[PDB]
Structure formats: structure tokens, C-alpha cells
Design an enzyme around this catalytic site. Structure first.
Site, PDB file in Angstrom:
ATOM      1  N   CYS A  65     -34.734  13.597  67.529  1.00 50.99           N
ATOM      2  CA  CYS A  65     -36.028  13.243  66.947  1.00 50.99           C
ATOM      3  C   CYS A  65     -37.204  13.944  67.622  1.00 50.99           C
ATOM      4  O   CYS A  65     -38.116  14.390  66.903  1.00 50.99           O
ATOM      5  CB  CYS A  65     -36.197  11.719  66.969  1.00 50.99           C
ATOM      6  SG  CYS A  65     -34.680  10.808  67.362  1.00 50.99           S
ATOM      7  N   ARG A  69     -24.426  12.388  75.399  1.00 49.10           N
ATOM      8  CA  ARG A  69     -24.806  11.211  76.155  1.00 49.10           C
ATOM      9  C   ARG A  69     -23.788  11.043  77.265  1.00 49.10           C
ATOM     10  O   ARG A  69     -22.591  11.265  77.057  1.00 49.10           O
ATOM     11  CB  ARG A  69     -24.876   9.956  75.264  1.00 49.10           C
ATOM     12  CG  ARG A  69     -26.079   9.951  74.323  1.00 49.10           C
ATOM     13  CD  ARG A  69     -25.973   8.883  73.247  1.00 49.10           C
ATOM     14  NE  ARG A  69     -27.066   8.971  72.278  1.00 49.10           N
ATOM     15  CZ  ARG A  69     -27.183   8.195  71.202  1.00 49.10           C
ATOM     16  NH1 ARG A  69     -26.263   7.268  70.940  1.00 49.10           N
ATOM     17  NH2 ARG A  69     -28.218   8.347  70.384  1.00 49.10           N
ATOM     18  N   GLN A 128     -24.452  14.177  64.410  1.00 58.02           N
ATOM     19  CA  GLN A 128     -24.681  13.343  63.236  1.00 58.02           C
ATOM     20  C   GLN A 128     -25.281  14.171  62.106  1.00 58.02           C
ATOM     21  O   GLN A 128     -25.881  15.223  62.328  1.00 58.02           O
ATOM     22  CB  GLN A 128     -25.627  12.187  63.548  1.00 58.02           C
ATOM     23  CG  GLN A 128     -25.171  11.215  64.609  1.00 58.02           C
ATOM     24  CD  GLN A 128     -25.981   9.925  64.545  1.00 58.02           C
ATOM     25  OE1 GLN A 128     -27.150   9.893  64.930  1.00 58.02           O
ATOM     26  NE2 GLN A 128     -25.373   8.873  64.033  1.00 58.02           N
ATOM     27  N   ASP A 157     -27.999  13.905  60.946  1.00 51.47           N
ATOM     28  CA  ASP A 157     -29.281  13.315  61.305  1.00 51.47           C
ATOM     29  C   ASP A 157     -30.388  13.865  60.414  1.00 51.47           C
ATOM     30  O   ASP A 157     -30.263  14.933  59.803  1.00 51.47           O
ATOM     31  CB  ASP A 157     -29.584  13.592  62.782  1.00 51.47           C
ATOM     32  CG  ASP A 157     -30.729  12.753  63.339  1.00 51.47           C
ATOM     33  OD1 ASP A 157     -31.085  11.699  62.746  1.00 51.47           O
ATOM     34  OD2 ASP A 157     -31.268  13.157  64.402  1.00 51.47           O
ATOM     35  N   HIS A 200     -34.999  13.280  59.651  1.00 48.65           N
ATOM     36  CA  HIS A 200     -36.236  12.545  59.853  1.00 48.65           C
ATOM     37  C   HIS A 200     -37.197  12.828  58.716  1.00 48.65           C
ATOM     38  O   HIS A 200     -37.364  13.976  58.305  1.00 48.65           O
ATOM     39  CB  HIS A 200     -36.873  12.881  61.198  1.00 48.65           C
ATOM     40  CG  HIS A 200     -36.017  12.492  62.354  1.00 48.65           C
ATOM     41  ND1 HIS A 200     -35.059  13.328  62.883  1.00 48.65           N
ATOM     42  CD2 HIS A 200     -35.927  11.331  63.045  1.00 48.65           C
ATOM     43  CE1 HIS A 200     -34.437  12.710  63.872  1.00 48.65           C
ATOM     44  NE2 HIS A 200     -34.942  11.493  63.986  1.00 48.65           N
ATOM     45  N   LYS A 238     -34.801  -1.623  60.283  1.00 51.95           N
ATOM     46  CA  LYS A 238     -33.849  -0.655  59.756  1.00 51.95           C
ATOM     47  C   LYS A 238     -32.938  -1.319  58.736  1.00 51.95           C
ATOM     48  O   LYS A 238     -32.735  -2.536  58.745  1.00 51.95           O
ATOM     49  CB  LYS A 238     -33.003  -0.018  60.870  1.00 51.95           C
ATOM     50  CG  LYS A 238     -32.036  -0.977  61.529  1.00 51.95           C
ATOM     51  CD  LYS A 238     -31.223  -0.306  62.622  1.00 51.95           C
ATOM     52  CE  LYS A 238     -30.570  -1.346  63.531  1.00 51.95           C
ATOM     53  NZ  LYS A 238     -29.637  -0.712  64.503  1.00 51.95           N
ATOM     54  N   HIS A 280     -35.929   7.737  60.796  1.00 49.13           N
ATOM     55  CA  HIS A 280     -34.662   8.333  61.210  1.00 49.13           C
ATOM     56  C   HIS A 280     -33.594   7.895  60.222  1.00 49.13           C
ATOM     57  O   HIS A 280     -33.534   6.718  59.856  1.00 49.13           O
ATOM     58  CB  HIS A 280     -34.217   7.902  62.619  1.00 49.13           C
ATOM     59  CG  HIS A 280     -35.315   7.795  63.633  1.00 49.13           C
ATOM     60  ND1 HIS A 280     -35.317   8.534  64.795  1.00 49.13           N
ATOM     61  CD2 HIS A 280     -36.403   6.992  63.699  1.00 49.13           C
ATOM     62  CE1 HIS A 280     -36.373   8.213  65.520  1.00 49.13           C
ATOM     63  NE2 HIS A 280     -37.049   7.279  64.878  1.00 49.13           N
TER      64      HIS A 280
HETATM   65 ZN   LIG Z   1     -34.160  10.154  65.172  1.00 47.18          ZN
END
Ligand SMILES: [Zn+2]
Length: 631
Positions: A332, A361, A379, A381, A383, A463, A509
Site C-alpha cells: 500500500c 513477513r 496477493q 492486491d 488499491h 471491511k 485495499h
Molecule cells: Zn493495502
């Protein structure tokens, strides 16, 4: 005066054993007697009753009789190993759901060949139809017995029992003897339907800092019928272990030089590519501009992000030229850097970036598992930068986009949840009002139900969660639509609104499938390693019966590959039936066999993964069949 389940009584003069009450009713019931329940207390069939009480005969038909059967099969493991490996030490041999095991100290480990010799030797021993003879033995004699047998672990177990126990049941299996509370079967004729299963590792006292032990697993049932039902379940269950499927199909592997990081082999990465290229189209059709951003970012950016406390102990850190960096655990802030390059007006929103972002991580290594729990993950992912007025429309679009993807992968059972404002949260209550209501209005317009989760949202916004059930009914969260009205302000994201007022945009996100490593693990087990045609790593194998067809096979293979199909040629100097059996085990959807007839007519003989013989066929007609089924 012994009372029976039917409420009646039978008189007995001079204390009588459980078995003797059975024989008094008849030889038949006696033959079926495994043990007895005197006033609800399970006792051996040879135990006497001196007072009067209520009795209940336990037979093979009782779940208690199956347990006692399983207990005595453990004793037989010791009987067989003390003959085969006389220097090993018996530890514990308890009962478990659907079976038993025996932990054994052996200097060298046990191999499958050990299991086979042991099970066979057990089967020989059970076939003698010998009586198990229980002798209640004083504690000093029991110690003397096991000391003479060199069973140092049994003696430590005896030194554990309190002084209240001055005698203990010794169960003699011919020349072998074991101790336990029992009861045990009166005779090995009840032990017909058993089998040893896995061999594994254990530890003394179950503590990992003591000596390791050999654990011999086994199962036992009242009859071979139930035994085989149990075997089919165990087979069908290993059929859905992605680690076992990953190894058998050569998809991936992990190793200690990179814990929690996947080595994707060619077939596994082919599976990955199918999914990533499909999700890349989702980006395209959903209005996302796909990006790619650096993985190594100044620690100063992570300290500004608002997430420093969550990740300060969960990131890989690295240094260069006296600057400290972290390997990114999320995309992000990188995406905010892209957004910050240009000046945006309200006219320009919404702006959407997607990224298959390689993240890391520093998860604890003991919690890693296959490709389901990893340290390095990508992912789907994305935004969205929008005004807060646009949150609802953006969420309805994403909802429609996510369901189509779940539908595409054959996930029809969905459960939707909304996580609400947590106790420790940031932002105005009025702002949490707008954001939460926007998620509710969006799902209402799409005519869906949802479960609400009080207090479960992130500190920076509510979310929507997308949970899906797989073919064996277990639930996974795949999709997330996370509202964030905090990080844009922290990192300088802004636009200009209706009257030149510079304002921070809302950031959403989102992901549909989540971690690709995890999603591939779910797909492997969901389909039990039998992938649909559009998804199989190797779709078609073109084989050749003779060396003459080899060049024609290569021509076929390269045509299908130009058609965009994942094809592999088998040109090895190997038996063709061997190639058939080997590629069938790999669950390849189609297997083209080429011989003298197929090369001369220009055809291809197709055999499907199921085994349906489609016969001969033109190469163009096979390509048409593939496009019909969306391969
Ligand atoms: Zn994010």
C-alpha cells in the site's frame, strides 16, 4: 445376586468371574465375551465378583469392545517387536480414536520394512489363538519382572505411580508380558481385523528435549469390513494433502535455506501462471492499472505508514550505505507513492492500482506450513483512491467482480461478513458512520445477506470479508474489501475537490483470492489434485509408440503450444503402456498416442484422464474440443 441389563437377576454361590456368568447363560455368549462392566466399571473377563452388583457383557459389537480390541493390538505390537528387536524398550501403548500406537525406544529408526516385518509377525502371533492371561502382581514383583527384561522405561512409569498402588495388572502374551489398566481381550481370536498404518516420531514424556521414540501407529476394528472402510477414508484424506500432492506431481518444494519461501517447479509455476494471467485480466476489466513497485523501502516510510507497531517485529530489515530499509510486507505505501507523483482533481478519481506484489513477513518459523502459511507471498492486491462519496459504487463493482471470480473457480458456496469499528480505532465516529453505511448500502444494492462482526474491523476502517467453502465443506477467507481513511493522510495522498479544497482521498485495499501461494494450496486440495482442463499444469501429453512417430509428435506438440495449450511430448525410449500408466497417475486431462496409423492419416488417438477412449481424430478436431470446454 448379579443384575443384568434386562433388569433380571441370576444367583451365584462362591465368587464368580465375568466369563463364568457368560458361560452360565450359554457357550455362545461366552464365546462372544470380551470383557464386562461391573456397575459401570470396565473389568477383564477373568476378574471375579465377590459382592453382588449389576453386570453388562461387553462384546465386539460395543464401542467399548473395539477399544479393548485396540488396546490388546498395542500389546501385540510389543510381543512382536520383543521377538524381532529384543534390545528395544517398550514405553507406552495407548488407545486413540480409531486406533492405537506404541512408543518405543530404538537406537536406530524404524523403516517401512520394519513395519512390514512387525505387522506380519503380529498377524502370525494373533493366528495362534492364545489366551491373554491377566495376573495381578505386587509392585515389588512387577519391578523385578521388568528389571529382568531390561525395560527401563516401564520401571520409570512404575516409579511414577503413587504408593497407593501396591499391585498392578500384568498381562501375559505367551512369553511376552505388558502392564496397563486394561482391560484386554481374553484371547487373540478377537484381534483378526487390524493393520499397522504409519510409523512416526515421538518423545519420552512428550517433551521435545528428551530422547526421541519410534511411534508405531495401527488401527483395529470388529471386522475386516469396517477396517477397509477406515482404509478408504485414510486414502481419500491423503488425496487432499497439498504437500503430498505437491510432491507427487512435482509442483514445488521448500527447504531450510529459505524457510517459508516456495520453490515453484515448472509444473507448479504453470499452475500459478494460469491463475495470475486470469487475475491480470480481472485487473484490466475492473479498471485497475497494474503496477510494480520496489520491495526494499526506507524504514522511515514504514514508521510514517501507521503500521510500524504491527510490523516492527515482523519484517526483514536490511542496510545499505548506513540507511536502514525493510523488505515490504504490504504494497500500500508503494502504491501511495505512485499516486503522489501526479496532481489529481476530484475529476480524476477513482484511480485504481493493482499489483501482484512480492511481499515478505518474518513470521515465526514454527508456524509455517506448506504453501498455506508462508513468509513470502504474492496477493492479487489492489488499491482504489476515491472520494468518500464514491465508496459505495466502488464496493458494489468490486463485489460483482469478486463473485464472478469465485464463480469462475467453481466456488458456489459463499458467506459474506462485515467487520465493524473496533474498540481501539482512529477517525471520527461520523467518518466510521459514513464508511460502515457505505458497505451496508453496497451489499444491499447487490441483494446479498451478510453477517456483522462487532469490534472486528481494522483500526483504520471497516471491511467486507468473502468466505468460501470448498468441496469438502471447510471455510476459507479469500476476498477482502478494506476501507482505509488513515494511511492516505499519513503518507501525503491528496486531491482537490469541488471548491479547490485539498483533501485526502479514501483508500480501499482489496483482494479477491488473497495470497496466491495460499489460493493455489486451496485449489490443489479442493480439486484433490485432479484439476479442470483449463487449470491443469500439463494439459496434454503427446506420446509416440515408435521412433518413427517421434518427429510427427514434435510437430503436433508445437502446433498445440502455438494454439496456447500447455503441452509436453513424451519421446523417451520407454514402454508405451508404462508411459500411459505414468501420465495417468499425473492426472493429465488428455493423452495423444501416435503410431504408424496416426502419422499416416494425419490423425491423433485421444485417451482422456477418466479413461474414455475418444478414438482417432483430426488434430484440428481435438483443438476444437479444447476450445469448447474453455481449456
Ligand atoms: Zn493495502
Amino acid at each position: 445376586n448379579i443384575t443384568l441389563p434386562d433388569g433380571s437377576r441370576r444367583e451365584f454361590e462362591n465368587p464368580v468371574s465375568v466369563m463364568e456368568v457368560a458361560q452360565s447363560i450359554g457357550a455362545g455368549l461366552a464365546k462372544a465375551t470380551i470383557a464386562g462392566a461391573v456397575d459401570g466399571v470396565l473389568v477383564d473377563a477373568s476378574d471375579v465378583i465377590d459382592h453382588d452388583a449389576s453386570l453388562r457383557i461387553i462384546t465386539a459389537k460395543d464401542e467399548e469392545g473395539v477399544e479393548i480390541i485396540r488396546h490388546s493390538c498395542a500389546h501385540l505390537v510389543g510381543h512382536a517387536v520383543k521377538q524381532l528387536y529384543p534390545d528395544v524398550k517398550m514405553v507406552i501403548g495407548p488407545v486413540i480414536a480409531e486406533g492405537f500406537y506404541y512408543d518405543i525406544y530404538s537406537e536406530r529408526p524404524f523403516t517401512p520394512d520394519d513395519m512390514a516385518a512387525i505387522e506380519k509377525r503380529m498377524g502370525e502371533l494373533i493366528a495362534q489363538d492364545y489366551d491373554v492371561i491377566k495376573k495381578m502382581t505386587p509392585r515389588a514383583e512387577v519391578i523385578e519382572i521388568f528389571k529382568a527384561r531390561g525395560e527401563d522405561y516401564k520401571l520409570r512409569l512404575i516409579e511414577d505411580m503413587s504408593e497407593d498402588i501396591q499391585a498392578m495388572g500384568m498381562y501375559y502374551h505367551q512369553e511376552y508380558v505388558d502392564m496397563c489398566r486394561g482391560p484386554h481381550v481374553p484371547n487373540t481370536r478377537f484381534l483378526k481385523a487390524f493393520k499397522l498404518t504409519r510409523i512416526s516420531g515421538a518423545y519420552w514424556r512428550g517433551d521435545a528435549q528428551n530422547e526421541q521414540l519410534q511411534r508405531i501407529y495401527g488401527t483395529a476394528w470388529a471386522d475386516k469390513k469396517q477396517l477397509e472402510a477406515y482404509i478408504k477414508r485414510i486414502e481419500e484424506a491423503e488425496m487432499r494433502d497439498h504437500r503430498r500432492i505437491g510432491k507427487q506431481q512435482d509442483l514445488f518444494h521448500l527447504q531450510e535455506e529459505a524457510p517459508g519461501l516456495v520453490f515453484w517447479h515448472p509444473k507448479g509455476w504453470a499452475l500459478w501462471q494460469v491463475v495470475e494471467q486470469y487475475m491480470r485480466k480481472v485487473y484490466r476489466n475492473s479498471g485497475y492499472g497494474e503496477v510494480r513497485c520496489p520491495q526494499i523501502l526506507d524504514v522511515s516510510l514504514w514508521k510514517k505508514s501507521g503500521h510500524w507497531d504491527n510490523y516492527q517485529d515482523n519484517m526483514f530489515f536490511t542496510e545499505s550505505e548506513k540507511r536502514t530499509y525493510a523488505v515490504k510486507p504490504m504494497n500500500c505505501p508503494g502504491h501511495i507513492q505512485v499516486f503522489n507523483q501526479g496532481l489529481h482533481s476530484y475529476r480524476d478519481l477513482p484511480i485504481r492500482y493493482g499489483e501482484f506484489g512480492s511481499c515478505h513477513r518474518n513470521e515465526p518459523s514454527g508456524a509455517l506450513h506448506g504453501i498455506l502459511r508462508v513468509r513470502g507471498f504474492t496477493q492479487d492486491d489492489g488499491h482504489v483512491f476515491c472520494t468518500e462519496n464514491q465508496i459505495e459504487s466502488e464496493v458494489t463493482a468490486f463485489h460483482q467482480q469478486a463473485l464472478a471470480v469465485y464463480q469462475h473457480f467453481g466456488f458456489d458456496e459463499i458467506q459474506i461478513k462485515i467487520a465493524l469499528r473496533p474498540e481501539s480505532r482512529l477517525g471520527d465516529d461520523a467518518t466510521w458512520d459514513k464508511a460502515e453505511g457505505a458497505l451496508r448500502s453496497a451489499l444491499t444494492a447487490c441483494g446479498v445477506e451478510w453477517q456483522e462482526l462487532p469490534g472486528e474491523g481494522a483500526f483504520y476502517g471497516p471491511k467486507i470479508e468473502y468466505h468460501l467453502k470448498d468441496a469438502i465443506g471447510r471455510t476459507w477467507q479469500l476476498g477482502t474489501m478494506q476501507v482505509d481513511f488513515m494511511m492516505p493522510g499519513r503518507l501525503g495522498a491528496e486531491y482537490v475537490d469541488e471548491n479547490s479544497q485539498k483533501k485526502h482521498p479514501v483508500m480501499l485495499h482489496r483482494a479477491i483470492v488473497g495470497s496466491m501461494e495460499r489460493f493455489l494450496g486451496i485449489l490443489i486440495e479442493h480439486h484433490a489434485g485432479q484439476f479442470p482442463a483449463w487449470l491443469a499444469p500439463t494439459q496434454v501429453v503427446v506420446a509416440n509408440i515408435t521412433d518413427a512417430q517421434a518427429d510427427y509428435v514434435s510437430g503436433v506438440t508445437k502446433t498445440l503450444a502455438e494454439q496456447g495449450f500447455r503441452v509436453s511430448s513424451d519421446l523417451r525410449n520407454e514402454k508405451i503402456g508404462y508411459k500411459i500408466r505414468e501420465h495417468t497417475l499425473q492426472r493429465v486431462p488428455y493423452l495423444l498416442v501416435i503410431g504408424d496409423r496416426e502419422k499416416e492419416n494425419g490423425a491423433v488417438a485421444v485417451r482422456t484422464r477418466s479413461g474414455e477412449d475418444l478414438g482417432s481424430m483430426s488434430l484440428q478436431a481435438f483443438i476444437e474440443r479444447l476450445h469448447a470446454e474453455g481449456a
